[PDB]
Structure formats: C-alpha cells, structure tokens
Design a protein around this ligand. Sequence first.
Ligand SMILES: N[C@@H](Cc1ccc(O)c(OCc2ccccc2[N+](=O)[O-])c1)C(=O)O
Ligand SMILES: [Ca+2]
Ligand SMILES: [Cl-]
Lengths: 306, 301
Amino acid sequence: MDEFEMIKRNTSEIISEEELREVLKKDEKSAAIGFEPSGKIHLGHYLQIKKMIDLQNAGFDIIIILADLAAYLNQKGELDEIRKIGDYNKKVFEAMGLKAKYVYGSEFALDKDYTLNVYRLALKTTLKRARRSMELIAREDENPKVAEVIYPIMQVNAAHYMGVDVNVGGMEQRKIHMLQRELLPKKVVCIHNPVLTGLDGEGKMSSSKGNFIAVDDSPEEIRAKIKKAYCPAGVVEGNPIMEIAKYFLEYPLTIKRPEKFGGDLTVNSYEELESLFKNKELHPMRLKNAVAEELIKILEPIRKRL
Amino acid sequence: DEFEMIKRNTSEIISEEELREVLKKDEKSAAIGFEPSGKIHLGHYLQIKKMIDLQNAGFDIIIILADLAAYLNQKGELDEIRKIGDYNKKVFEAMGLKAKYVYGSEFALDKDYTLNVYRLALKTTLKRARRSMELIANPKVAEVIYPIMQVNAAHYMGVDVNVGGMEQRKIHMLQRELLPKKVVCIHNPVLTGLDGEGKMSSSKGNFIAVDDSPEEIRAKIKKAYCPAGVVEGNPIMEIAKYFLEYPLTIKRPEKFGGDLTVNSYEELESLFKNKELHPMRLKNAVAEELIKILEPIRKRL
Ligand SMILES: N[C@@H](Cc1ccc(O)c(OCc2ccccc2[N+](=O)[O-])c1)C(=O)O
Ligand SMILES: [Ca+2]
Ligand SMILES: [Cl-]
C-alpha cells in the first residue's frame, strides 16, 4: 500500500478500486494516457504526467499516446503540423521526468484490425451518447462534423487494441471511459485526475483559453500570471492559487513576513495552508507571492531542460 | 531546505536569524544533554530525531551524558551509570545518530573548570540565578549552582547550537546573556505519557520504549488515554504528529466513506477533532505505523 497510496493520491476517482487491487497483483501491468498534441503544455498536463510517474513506481509499464489523429479529427490542424507539436510534447514529458513508450496514435489507429473494430463499435454506439461523451472535449463547432462522433469510438478502441490494464485521464474523459467499460470484453481500470481551474476562475485551464501557466513560462511571466489570478479571500474551491498549492507545491513551505502580522509562517502541509487561508490568517497577496516563488522553483528543472 | 528541516516540530528557536547565520559556516556543532536512562522511549527519540536533522544539515553532534547529575540525583554509582550511558549510545546509533559522546564527570570536576564555575558564581547574582530557575524549581544551594554550572558547560563545549526542552529556556537565555559567543538554542516539545497524566516517563505502561515488541506496543496503545474528539493532551495524536510518515492510510468501512488516506497530520487532526475518526481505529493505525517505524531500531538492538 505504499504503492497504492502513491496511485490514489490526488486523483478524483478510480473505477474501480476493487479491480485496481486485482491489477496490482501482477508482475506485468500497463497503463496508458493520450494527449492531443498542444503547442502549450500547462499544469494540467503536468498533473497527469505526475500520475503516470506514480503508476510507473508501482510497477506499471507506461504508454503515452501522442494523439495526432485525435487532434486531427478534433480540428487542430493538419497531421504533419500536429505531429511536429507531438514531438515537442514528447520532449516536455521527458523533461518532466517521465521515461516511457511514446507512440503516435497514427502508428496503430489506422491498422486494418483497429479500423474494423472501430466499425463494429460504431454499430453499438448511439449518436446521442457519442456526442454527449465529447461535450467537454470537442472543439466548439456551430456546424458539428462527423469527425466528432468517430473520435470517442476510436478512443474506446485504443485500450482494447493495446491491452492495457489501466487508462488515465482528466475528469473530462469520464464519459468516454464509461462507454469503454460497457462496450469492451475486458474491463480496464480508469483513473481520473482533477481538472484545474483557469487562472481567472472562469471554467477550466486550457491551451485555447489563455488562462493557464505553461511549464516553460519564465519566472517573470509566472509572477505576472499569478498576480492577476483569481484568489478570493478565504475561499478554497475554484481558487486556482490554492489548487496549485495542493497539487504541485512541496511542504514544508516557508511564507516570510514581518512580525506585525504573525511573522514568518512555516506551513507543514497543504491542510495547514488551507486552514490559515480560510481563517483569513493569510492574505491573498502573500499567498500569491509564496505560491509564485515555489512554483517557479518546482518548474525550474523542466525549464532548464527545454 | 536546511532551515525548514531543523525548525519542523520545534517549540522555539532562539533565534531564527542567528540560526540562518550558523548555517552559512562550513564547520558547525550542536550539543544536547541526556541523563542516562535504562529505557529509551519516544520522548528521547523525539530529541534524537532533532539531532539527526542537525547532523543532516552539516552539524557535528555532541551528546553530553549527564552522569554526574544522575549520580547527584540518586540514580546510582558512577560506574553503574556509565554502563547505562554506554547502552544509550548504542540505542542512539541504532536510531541513526552519528555523534561524539562526553560524560559530565570527564570535564565538570576539573580544577580549571571548577574555578570558572566559581568565577561565574562571583559574577552572578542570586536573584538572576533564582529567576533562571523559577520554572525548573525549602530551596537548596544546589538550585543556584545548577545554572552557573550549565553556563560553564556551554562555554566549555563551545558549540554553535544548544538543544533541549522549553523547561531549559531560562538557562539557555542566561547562557546567551553571560557568554561572549551567543549560542543558538532549539527547544523541542515534550510528549504526553500514555496515561495522559503528564510527560512521558518510565512509569509502568506510561511510555513506549523504542525496543518494545510489537505485542507490547499494541497492548500499551490499546489502553492509552485517547478520548474521542480530543487532540490536546492526547498521546496517540502526538505520536501521529511527531513520529509517523505521511501520507498514511487508515482502514475504515465503506459506510463511513471507506479507507482514509490522510495527507498530513493536520488532516488527521481535523478528522479526529470532528469525531470523523473513532479512537479505536486511530489507535490501531498508530500502533501498526509506529511498529513499522521502530522496527529497524529494534532489529539493530
Ligand atoms: N481524448 C484525449 C486524447 C486521447 C486519449 C486516449 C487515447 O487513447 C487517445 O488516442 C487514440 C485516439 C482516440 C481518438 C481519436 C484518435 C486517436 N488516435 O490518435 O488515433 C487520445 C484528449 O482529450 O487529449
Ligand atoms: Ca520488552
Ligand atoms: Cl553531568
């Protein structure tokens, strides 16, 4: 359970913890995650790669899908441009400390046997359910394309084709994963990570919303981005600064300050920080300052490698 | 970070800025005094862990084994106390501490040492000496000799850092007043005994010894003071705070929410204060974690 603790920690749900126990009893086990290549890799990506590294340390072989064909179907551009971004993304994930098997979706998702099962699955997936599964994933389209409903079926089939025991993704993948659990002969365990709040507090962090910290942002950019961030005094949920403190910072954490309010604060844990903030013993401005400097240092090794 | 490793789980540092200055030097030392004890318990272990923190931050560690004080306080003959102290040395080594050891009797009766005690006695008012002892103490002459003896011992050691309990606070402040070299003082908390009636001591069933068997640990924790919802003065919660590693998992039935993974002591504290974690499940968890923490020590002894 030191391993299992490593896995469950900071996830939103595991479907199911029962089945996940049975998986852990094996000398060979594999876990996969896919990412549409993105020109900006931000903290939401980093959270998920941290979880893949967790799974690695519990004895899992890790597969990262650079999902060039998914990004193509989801209107991100032409394959050759997308693949270039994918190669950059691979370098960022490696810089994050993940040594894994990096594979382009198009290396397997065009195989005759893959496609034939996409077509089998299409006969069993309603249009309603396919479109519903994409509400949090599909690029906004006034006039939605056929591509949008092929995408979730292709994703269902990826775990079947590769024979992985565990699929990891953000909570926005939840509906595809439930479809996958109903349709495939072997259940695969699904681990869902939280979705970070955008820096302005409006909805989720996204490469296309301009409301994110990128792992390669400069110190000066990170300070500017945190200083303008939404950070309501004493409110924790939907507060992206507190989310950063929860999911990325290392404790103990020293928050310097003059003796005239409370003096220097050595914070033992995120929970201590949460108490201090909810009781308004720590002001948003001082929280932001400390979080900016700590995140700059956490991200420095990734920056240095790119 | 080195400062944070030294501060964690201390009661006070006199002073933090001075500590940060010491941390810049490439050669630095810290001392602590222990009266030799036939059983080494978690109260001792708390203080040795703090010397290990210092050792890991580059300090050379000196342990003063206080055999003269023990001899004067009626704990036996000096040769008998030496045998206990030599055992304590093996326990501290098993705990991970690499230190130099000195017995009080090896320096504190030397002629030039004694003359300096008397020099300090001539300089030091009874009023100031009594004030330094107000907390530790028909008062005896011994009461005012103790503080000037402690000051002289700090002068004789010449360490950068002194470590002890808040009980020693006023002695440490007198050392800082009277001596040219300003020693940095680190004060550690004390542990409640398993009975909840005072500080951990060698009273029957009132301590966990670091070499207690797993069954002895389970039996003592089972009958310890641990009232529902109470964190203050709760020795089981203090053990979770000062010795356990986080995160940790508490098995709990699904109708309560299922197994608990607690990220930190503070998360444990809120849960227990709220009666969201029952004393018997806290006790069972703390006992099993503590057994695992102590096992490498037990096996080296
Ligand atoms: N939906 C994910 C992307 C993702 C997740 C899991 C996968 O197995 C995955 O790749 C397979 C795939 C799924 C859907 C369409 C195309 C492909 N493809 O690249 O061949 C992509 C995202 O939102 O970035
Ligand atoms: Ca025994
Ligand atoms: Cl002594």
